[model samples]
Target chain A: ESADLRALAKHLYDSYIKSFPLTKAKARAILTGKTTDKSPFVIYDMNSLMMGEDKIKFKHITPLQEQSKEVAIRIFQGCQFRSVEAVQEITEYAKSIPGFVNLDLNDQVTLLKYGVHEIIYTMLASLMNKDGVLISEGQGFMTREFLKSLRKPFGDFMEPKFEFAVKFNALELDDSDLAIFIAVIILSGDRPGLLNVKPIEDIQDNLLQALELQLKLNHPESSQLFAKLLQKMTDLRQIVTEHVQLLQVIKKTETDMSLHPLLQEIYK
Target chain B: ESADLRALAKHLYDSYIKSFPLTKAKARAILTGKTTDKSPFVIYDMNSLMMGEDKIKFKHITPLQEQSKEVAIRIFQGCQFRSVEAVQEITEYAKSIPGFVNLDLNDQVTLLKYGVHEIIYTMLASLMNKDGVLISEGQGFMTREFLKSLRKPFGDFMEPKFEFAVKFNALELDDSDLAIFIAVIILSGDRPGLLNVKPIEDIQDNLLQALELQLKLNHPESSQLFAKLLQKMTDLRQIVTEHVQLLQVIKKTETDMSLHPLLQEIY
Candidate 1:
């Protein structure tokens, strides 16, 4: 949870460049957050997703049929929320958009996030090969739809390089951290003035949350970036920092039998 | 249209970095491709996307609302092709995972692209006034499902960094490359590989072919890296000369029109 996310993001940037160099190099600039004009992660309009209504097309002269088996990809599951029952709370606040026009934009945004959630669970089912519980007891955790009310998908993003500069990385997730992340997002996304901050404010939280979780898993050496991110979150702007505190509060209430997964890791 | 899509791919890299840099320095290393990592992109599994999933169990911490609205992001529209109906005859030769999986697996992967695709568009729609085309058209490009196989939403993935290091100020698509980016994910989710190549034989036709198309849109510089990628695809593949020839062919095909669309700026 320190800053390996930055490392991970950087690794990804390099991987693309390593494999595709020139094009990827260009792509890397965007991945690395080099310039505003070049970032590949553009925040586009949903209307542009012309479903089969493309005006112009690019030709793949070589065709990609036979090579179906030759191409391979690795997927990363997006986040999930508790329930629409829990998620619908945003409908009241969804109307707050300055000049909101799109009807059901709230639903549209929520459904899209649900899409991420449903698919993320689907990925877990495929990977876990069973639908037991990966996160919130299969009941779901943080709703992306709730997050959507704050802003759109590509709308909130960060350049990992900034955080990755000097950070440690972990390979897995502990128990407490996951729950913390969930609680934080739920709290923050629902807050009053989230979208009003800077874009750095948005991406920064996600990255930091990722970084801290990685640290909890790896427990990398202490670093300034990690500490600063942790401290900066005192205001709890980002999801990562928000959860760091939420988990503490939840733990106090958890006077139950077993220990939190992450707390156990602390003993280890 | 260099063999490896480098000539054209560079445009995407450039855009990725510029739009979402975390800091000035991290951005610089990525541009030079000087970051020191064995593998590039560092992707966390789907298991931990939610703030509550891993370290914190259900917490509410997302800076989107806390931060300023001026926050920017480098949009990435990843996809998984169930399979493209237009040119399957010549394609399908690549999608191998340890090698290629069965058709079922392929479709599963392609369908999953929609998961990411949806998040991408949804996020865009919520941004700015829901009026910015920068996020609009990009959303439209990823909705088609006429290909082969289907992705399971959270299926597999391949994430690359947004390296903004190229010369694409010339991608004057209708005089407006403004907030909109039109790209098709030839290889994103479950369907398997739409345009990505892994084997050596795939170098000659598939990889170069798609790149040729990508190049026509970006008008990028030459790509030596793509040449190297071709060399990688072959098993005991041909010499560099043979790979170099692939580049030559890519250049020639850049002017070809019998393709699906002659001037699409993205895949």
Candidate 2:
């Protein structure tokens, strides 16, 4: 039964991976020991910037005060679009999970609303390393230091995600592991305003059993991996809460900035 | 070997419990199913206050503006003294742990300085239940709601501790479990400004082995208790960091508020 659940989870992941454009190739390459370090766009090291070395060659070196806002706005807009797509992907994925549709429709929405950012952040581990994340569908890399250069709230937001991502990536999870993990996140009984907790919890327990077995099979050496991943979920909760608080700050200040309709609902 | 480590840890805890003024009687009673639900002082329920009840009968109903400061000051002073004693207790416990003294004198101070509050907060589980903490050596009870009524920073400071304490108490750890846990906190290689990381990590590894073993034996039904306890340590790290930030705010605004000399050093 667990094997069948694992296969279903992996199948779901394979389908989802085709749509997630960020960097599965990079994750696969790193995992299979087939190295591909090249990208079409120039990769900037955040550490270089921190060490007083400006690797970001601006066409014209402009004052930060003039360009920071423009750059930050562009980043925010990009994130808003990606978030819209991510919510769609997660909603689709959630719909397919066993017993998820059995949940009250309102409860399903509540779970998705609370669980989306955390799921997105967890999925982000595939595209991230200790130094930074692969951006532009593996075409470009943005160093952690580079993200820190963005203006307030934007800069503040990326640091915690990077910190979380760096550690999460260390767990070396494959696509199947992530699928059940995402299901676990979506089926969580702890989300506020949950109506059918027992059913949701029932789903999560089954998912967790499959996840634990899958993890043990995948990484036989790591006796503690299951527990460590659970801790990461706890960490992700804190990160998402902090992200929402920062979003509130951004909303108050950046009145002209627009989030996608879906994002606005979730953020609200 | 594990048995000996557990015995040493429980022995250390036994001695520490003798000096700790807070209620061990309560912890024992609850664990043994012989709870004594009584205290000498008037117990105020924080939840009752939130539910819009006047549980606190002031001798004279004064404006919050006038008395809040005075009441907050007294609480702060009380905490300052308790913090001093907590630090002393943790330091002695750390010294007694095997291989702890082998670390550099400077590293010892650094570990104690960073680890004290996290350890103190963990020990606070003994005096806490879901609703509130026992105070004045089990003579009184203060509900979570009452603490929330204390002025801004003081009120802000307590809510997280209660949240953490409420969850930590649910783990049902006894003294032996906590003794090794405290040692793990102190001997952490993760603490900033450590000169010798390897030796500290070695000590922590040994302590974690003992802790894991002890927790399993103590909590046979809880398969995830060890991991949960580890996560609690991580939670404690964040809590202590948040606490230090709050202390800075209190320091700047409440300049008249004095911390104990020992607490002044630690906080």
- Candidate with top DockQ is 2
lDDT of 1 by residue, A73-175 (tens): 0000122123232233232222221122243344334323322222122123211211111122221212222222222222122212113211211212222
Model 2 C-alpha lDDT per residue in residues B1-267, reported as the tens digit of each score? 877777766766775676454545555464323464653344464333232214333222222433454666655666676677778867877778887787799999999878887888887767776667755555545676778778777888778888888778777777667777777778876567889887987767677767777887888877556755776676776787788888888668755545556545654
| TM agreement with the true structure for every prediction | 0.21, 0.74
Q: Mark the regions of model 1 whose C-alpha exceeds 4 Å error after superposition.
A: A1-172, A176-180, A187-268, B1-186, B190-267
- In order of the candidates, what TM-score does chain B achieve? 0.20, 0.80
Cα lDDT tens digits, model 1, B93-183, are 1232112344345443453443233223222222212111111111111111111112322111110001100112112221111111222
Model 1 interface root-mean-square deviation: 21.0
Where does model 2 exceed 4 Å of error? A1-25, A28-39, A43-71, A143-157, A180-190, A195-217, A233-238, B1-39, B43-69, B143-145, B148-157, B195-209, B228-249, B256-267
* Candidate 1's TM-score: 0.21
TM-score top scorer: 2
lDDT of each: 0.27, 0.69
Error of 2 at A132 (Å): 3.9
Each prediction's DockQ against the real complex: 0.01, 0.15
Worst 10 residues of 1 chain A by lDDT: A69-78
